[PDB]
Amino acid sequence: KVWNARNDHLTINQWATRIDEILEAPDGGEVIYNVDENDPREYDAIFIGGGAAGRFGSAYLRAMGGRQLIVDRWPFLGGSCPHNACVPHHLFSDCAAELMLARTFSGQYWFPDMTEKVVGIKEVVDLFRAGRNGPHGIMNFQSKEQLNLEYILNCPAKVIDNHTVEAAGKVFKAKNLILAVGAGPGTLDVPGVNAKGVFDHATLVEELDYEPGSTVVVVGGSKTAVEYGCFFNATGRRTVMLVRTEPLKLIKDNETRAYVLDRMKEQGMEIISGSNVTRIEEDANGRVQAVVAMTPNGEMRIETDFVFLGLGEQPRSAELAKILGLDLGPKGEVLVNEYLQTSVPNVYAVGDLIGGPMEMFKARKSGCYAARNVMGEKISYTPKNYPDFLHTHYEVSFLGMGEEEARAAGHEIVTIKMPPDTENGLNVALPASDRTMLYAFGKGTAHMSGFQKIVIDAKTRKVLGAHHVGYGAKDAFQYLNVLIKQGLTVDELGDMDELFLNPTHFIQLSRLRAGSKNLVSL
Amino acid sequence: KVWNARNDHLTINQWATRIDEILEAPDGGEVIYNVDENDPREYDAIFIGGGAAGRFGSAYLRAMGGRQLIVDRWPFLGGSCPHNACVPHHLFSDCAAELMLARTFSGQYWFPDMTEKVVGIKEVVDLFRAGRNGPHGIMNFQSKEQLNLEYILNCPAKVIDNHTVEAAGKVFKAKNLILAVGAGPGTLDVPGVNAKGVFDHATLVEELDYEPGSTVVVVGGSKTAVEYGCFFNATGRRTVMLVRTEPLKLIKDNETRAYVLDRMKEQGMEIISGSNVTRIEEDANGRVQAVVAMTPNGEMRIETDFVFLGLGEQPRSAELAKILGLDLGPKGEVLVNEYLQTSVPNVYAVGDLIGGPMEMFKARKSGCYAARNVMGEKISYTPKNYPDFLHTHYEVSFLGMGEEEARAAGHEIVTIKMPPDTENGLNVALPASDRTMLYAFGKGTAHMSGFQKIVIDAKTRKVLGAHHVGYGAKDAFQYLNVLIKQGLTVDELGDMDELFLNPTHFIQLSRLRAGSKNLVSL
């Protein structure tokens, strides 16, 4: 069943409703056909996948005046982020931060008693499921009515050759193909991995039909594992993380990483490094009852009825690589040159499909650049020197070099941080700003107010790296990184206008030291 | 009683304790004398006041190799901000934001029933009083041990002439004086203004010995009035704001202002424009019982036992002007040229003492620029095109021109905002990020997820203004403003690396429109 929506103009909320209906449809739902029947031009590019990369790539290509076509197996545009990736992740992280606050000040002011309070994980996941069609509605609307895009949703794409694709029972031709099918959840090849009670970011928001027990086991040690792990811990459950190597290796500054790990442990999280799951035990009904793993100190068994796999995402290259004969990398990523061109003529690859970094900025930009190249604008794209972030119970932002990294690299440096290095350590009222004021003023909670630092080259006076743990600096790192790439110095940072009290105190702290020709750490 | 602390080296926490002791000492406390009695150099400048302007100016002067002396009547450095201004303001705004969240989701998830819950204002003020010495301790420690500053605290400065100052019973000479005594609370010339129950930012944290009733009257529409007003409202009290002119004029963009005001009213706040208090009624016990004011709709009477004055701060220029013969402005501000020089030879004026804008960046920067001039470096300072912000129950950030302002300036423009202007209005799941996810997904709460907009010149493609209501963008505005002053275009904005989900969605949204030669609003 195909629905020609081309001449239909549903509102954001109407789209939200129609999408929900199609998703919960037993037959699978009708195909959303939004194609221009009067355009004589041949598609400059057909996007296989309409997620972050595909949608943005199409938006830009269309803006340039070219013709595009999106084909996605989901009845909505936007991809994984709004359905099971970044959006739910941020809802969960919001809860983790709010819950850490409530537990810290339990039984104080307007804060209820959290002593034996266990928050429902399913209730929050259900909250997400109940409102995720909202964002999906905005995407279908914005893409059609505002971005003037053509698309076919709720129907998998069928790639015949580098110029032909079958969709909605029809066959389409294009000058180029832009592969943007993203990546899928990583898994384990251990007994019990298919048991009821084992989840990943994708299945968690589709198959959680019970409320997890008191203990949760998380497998992995990077972003996803830590973000979801802190949320589970925040709901009041004993959370054990089994990390194959070492956790949070993305945090290069040693002190910053230590602060983050220390605060996670203070919240009760257990992180076991060098551990490898060997078996997920099933009970008589096929449900998880425990996790067995090998560690540096021997085998261990953790009783649990809920296991979350937070492993790296894997590029969905298999099918396309076989159909087109694409050259692949060691992790299955599709190989491409600086112009996003694969080994197959007129075939580009973007987003998570081409590997790391697997972030939205990389997906959207690669999608746009591939589009520009398809339109004749030869432009290279090699992601490098970008800001990054992750959530624990705090927002953790970082860019550039860590302190030890800079000194080992041959850079004479000075650092400016908060709190200062003294015998009182973290037990002081700074750093402090929006969302950390209660920690800064509470009895025995000052050490929880945050940690931040900038690394500066003592000779060039340029900022080499910035690190922040707390809240409200993430957005700033987007803009600060650009200034740093321009050659930002401690003097220029000190000359800015701060908005006190600020999440990052970099501006004024730089000003305190910038008056000297021979910089000194603070 | 003078304590020579020069060769003593207290830790941050020992300083916190010592300062508290001196502040609570019945006799007034001992003088804190930190002077290098062995240094034979003349003082380049004596700073009258060691607040934001005096402390930063001293730090910069010392960094440049000059010699300085700070004299302050309080036993700590840092001024009003940590004792009764910005720091408590932020603790209160943090509470206001958390309380709106709790009230919005009352009885939902882990949130307790807030239906009939009135938070204790005195409890929060007491929390502030109990922990404010922490920041004070850091300031005394940082200034002495890290910034190598000389200072005399807990002693009023007694200026003799433009080169001589008395402090701690000793007479000091200097090449220049830098006046940095700030400003004091503004008051009303009406009957009953001195009744018990009438407070300003300063007296609120020193004399609140009772818990306010169910109604609070706030006089003024300034940032402070609005910030404290929303906090009082958040505690569960009927809050009436008596604004002299138009509410929130600082927010130039009409749409942004409307959103902010509408959200305040949704929380139950009553905002009265063009109102002037005529009398504060006292009961037989000498306590405020009602406020009477004239408004565009006639005289009104509001019963209350707690009134908060959020009027403009007044420069502390009287005594210094009499002694030195300083030229003053109509509001009592000390007049200075662009080098921060007063009408008196070798005497500079900085911070709130020289008038608006009364902000920390202005205080600190003016202090440093005066210091540089004292050290022989001719440098002018004229605050202009700076970012700004204020708190309601949300963080409100703004810079540059509002939409209407831009068109009146002759610019042909386009705008990029969230949420989109459609039939569904604000009732959609965008904008969304950290701390707005629950609002975005909650039943009927989507409209509370925020509002944001950038104003762009259609021809030059340059960003002319940025506006945001939500959380986590404040810090970013510090850096974004610098980029905008450099001539940021929509294309350059789109070329940045975003950190999704981001408080400001400006980067990716700009990218969605940047591909066209003829820009169209989103």
Ligand SMILES: Cc1cc2nc3c(=O)[nH]c(=O)nc-3n(C[C@H](O)[C@H](O)[C@H](O)COP(=O)(O)OP(=O)(O)OC[C@H]3O[C@@H](n4cnc5c(N)ncnc54)[C@H](O)[C@@H]3O)c2cc1C
């Ligand atoms: C738990 C989690 C949290 C994350 N948090 C963040 C974060 O905070 N910030 C950030 O920047 N990044 C985050 N990411 C990563 C980010 O989600 C991805 O990098 C980005 O979504 C990838 O976009 P893409 O366009 O390459 O793929 P996707 O957006 O995943 O979309 C691929 C699209 O192709 C479609 N498709 C697949 N196969 C076919 C087929 N055969 N036929 C038709 N359509 C097909 C899909 O249905 C989908 O719409 C997170 C990821 C995870 C897993």
Ligand SMILES: Cc1cc2nc3c(=O)[nH]c(=O)nc-3n(C[C@H](O)[C@H](O)[C@H](O)COP(=O)(O)OP(=O)(O)OC[C@H]3O[C@@H](n4cnc5c(N)ncnc54)[C@H](O)[C@@H]3O)c2cc1C
């Ligand atoms: C309620 C409130 C909230 C605010 N919130 C913000 C905000 O969020 N962000 C922002 O940027 N700005 C904010 N401000 C404004 C900011 O507090 C001021 O602009 C800044 O503190 C002024 O610094 P200053 O150095 O000029 O004066 P101050 O820092 O106030 O210090 C003047 C100093 O001089 C001393 N002094 C006075 N008389 C004498 C004397 N005779 N002898 C010796 N010492 C003397 C004082 O004891 C004091 O230490 C706020 C103000 C108020 C009132």
Ligand SMILES: CC(=O)CSCCS(=O)(=O)O
């Ligand atoms: C409304 C929504 O889907 C938020 S998740 C971002 C999807 S996209 O703009 O990167 O396609």
Ligand SMILES: CC(=O)CSCCS(=O)(=O)O
């Ligand atoms: C620690 C503290 O006082 C925070 S308030 C800022 C005071 S100053 O650095 O502007 O002097």
